[PDB]
Amino acid sequence: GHMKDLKGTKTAENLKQGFIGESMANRRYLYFAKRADEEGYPEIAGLLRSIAEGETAHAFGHLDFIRQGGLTDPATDKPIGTLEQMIESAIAGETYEWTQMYPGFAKVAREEGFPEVAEWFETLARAEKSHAEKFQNVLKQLKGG
Amino acid sequence: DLKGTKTAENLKQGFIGESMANRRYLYFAKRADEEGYPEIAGLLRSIAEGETAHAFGHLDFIRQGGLTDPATDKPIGTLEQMIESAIAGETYEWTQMYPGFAKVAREEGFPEVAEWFETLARAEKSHAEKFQNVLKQLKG
Ligand SMILES: [Cl-]
Ligand SMILES: [Co+2]
Ligand SMILES: [Co+2]
Ligand SMILES: [Co+2]
Ligand SMILES: [Co+2]
Ligand SMILES: [Co+2]
């Protein structure tokens, strides 16, 4: 019963929302752990890091149900059944970010008078272009053998 | 002041995207691992570290600008505030979000998915309690 079709269901949408929240929880808790680290709270830092592993398990399980239910990647709306498809999903999202999202964010940051945040968004646009090209070169290797 | 700007929203959306990218690439790496593509797995893992740096830098600008946590809309300036943000999100998840998802899954005919969401509700309740015990240790 693991392969029941989830397309068009509310449950499909709920898996995507769960994946988003679990992804953020891991990042948040590892960021908070660094504050605990600096201040000298190793037990708190360690708890944050261990709970973060929990949120990894939660996120990965949501992606298993997404993949098995015939759903697409929460970030890109691309299929992620095969390794080739996974890499194509990575390329699609990186391409969105370097062609559109980060340059757009930089332009708006400059307009609103946040040049330091704009510089950061421009760095990230260049970074996601580098990422897209490296994934493009790997895909070429996969599809060539 | 970043509060109420479009740049504040774009930092929040950047954080969301970057958080998902790290999770996605580490998940994809496991498939590369199984199939015998260590260079592809390694690349996914190294790029994933890039996306960690991106997400953390978004949180730096958020925290420095006095903006709230993307996940909870709670302040994250101090360690105590960070633990309070963790508690608020976990409490929403176990009291509302996961039980609600479970009910919808059951009602749509997906018992296995519902069981998963009920597991996660219990897990987030355990997380919340462990964070509440941390906050007691700090605030006291
Ligand atoms: Cl401690
Ligand atoms: Co089955
Ligand atoms: Co979780
Ligand atoms: Co990237
Ligand atoms: Co990134
Ligand atoms: Co949790």
Side-chain angles (χ1 to χ4, degrees), chain B residues 57 66 69 71 73-74 92 104 114:
Chain B
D69 186 331
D73 197 27
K74 300 299 193 191
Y92 168 67
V104 168

Side-chain angles (χ1 to χ4, degrees), chain B:
Chain B
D1 192 346
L2 280 162
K3 186 180 162 52
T5 67
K6 178 47 186 345
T7 297
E9 186 61 20
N10 296 340
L11 281 164
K12 171 180 180 182
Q13 190 52 222
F15 178 74
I16 293 167
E18 291 292 343
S19 294
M20 287 199 280
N22 174 280
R23 271 59 280 284
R24 285 159 60 238
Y25 294 170
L26 294 183
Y27 185 84
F28 299 166
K30 298 175 106 195
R31 179 63 69 84
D33 287 337
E34 289 181 337
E35 292 191 4
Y37 293 111
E39 303 96 328
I40 296 178
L43 177 70
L44 281 158
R45 287 180 174 101
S46 185
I47 289 178
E49 299 293 346
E51 313 308 16
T52 298
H54 294 168
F56 289 173
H58 295 326
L59 288 181
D60 287 337
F61 282 111
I62 287 168
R63 171 186 64 62
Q64 286 168 2
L67 297 179
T68 60
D69 186 331
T72 64
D73 197 27
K74 300 299 193 191
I76 52 164
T78 67
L79 184 58
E80 281 178 33
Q81 286 178 331
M82 293 173 180
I83 298 308
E84 289 170 327
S85 179
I87 295 161
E90 301 277 359
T91 300
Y92 168 67
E93 290 168 1
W94 83 256
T95 67
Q96 296 178 228
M97 193 189 75
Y98 283 130
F101 291 180
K103 177 181 185 290
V104 168
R106 284 195 182 282
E107 291 190 1
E108 291 188 318
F110 303 121
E112 303 92 335
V113 175
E115 180 175 76
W116 171 244
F117 288 144
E118 289 290 6
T119 296
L120 269 49
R122 289 190 293 274
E124 307 308 356
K125 184 176 179 177
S126 297
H127 293 171
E129 288 166 348
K130 298 286 174 12
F131 287 128
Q132 289 174 323
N133 289 344
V134 169
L135 188 66
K136 288 191 278 181
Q137 296 172 146
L138 290 172
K139 281 248 176 250

Side-chain angles (χ1 to χ4, degrees), chain A:
Chain A
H2 65 304
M3 296 308 296
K4 288 192 283 288
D5 184 11
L6 290 180
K7 289 191 293 300
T9 66
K10 188 61 201 147
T11 293
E13 295 166 14
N14 293 341
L15 284 164
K16 167 181 183 170
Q17 178 182 344
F19 176 74
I20 292 168
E22 292 292 345
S23 294
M24 289 196 281
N26 173 280
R27 270 58 277 285
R28 289 159 56 236
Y29 295 167
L30 294 182
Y31 184 83
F32 299 164
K34 296 177 159 204
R35 184 58 67 92
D37 287 338
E38 70 184 38
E39 295 188 6
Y41 296 112
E43 301 95 332
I44 295 175
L47 179 67
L48 281 157
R49 285 182 173 96
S50 188
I51 290 179
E53 298 294 343
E55 315 306 18
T56 299
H58 294 169
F60 293 176
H62 291 331
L63 289 181
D64 291 337
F65 288 103
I66 286 170
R67 186 170 52 68
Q68 293 176 346
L71 303 179
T72 60
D73 185 333
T76 63
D77 197 25
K78 299 300 194 192
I80 51 166
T82 68
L83 181 61
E84 274 189 13
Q85 288 177 328
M86 290 170 180
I87 300 307
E88 281 170 340
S89 177
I91 295 162
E94 298 280 0
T95 296
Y96 171 66
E97 293 165 357
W98 78 257
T99 65
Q100 296 157 67
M101 197 188 72
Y102 281 130
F105 291 181
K107 173 183 163 36
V108 167
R110 288 191 181 281
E111 286 169 346
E112 287 190 319
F114 300 116
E116 301 96 321
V117 177
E119 286 293 4
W120 172 241
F121 288 144
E122 288 161 3
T123 296
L124 268 50
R126 291 189 291 271
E128 306 311 358
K129 182 182 170 50
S130 299
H131 294 173
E133 291 165 346
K134 290 162 185 314
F135 286 132
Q136 290 175 321
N137 271 333
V138 147
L139 185 66
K140 175 223 59 63
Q141 295 171 318
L142 261 189
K143 289 197 189 288

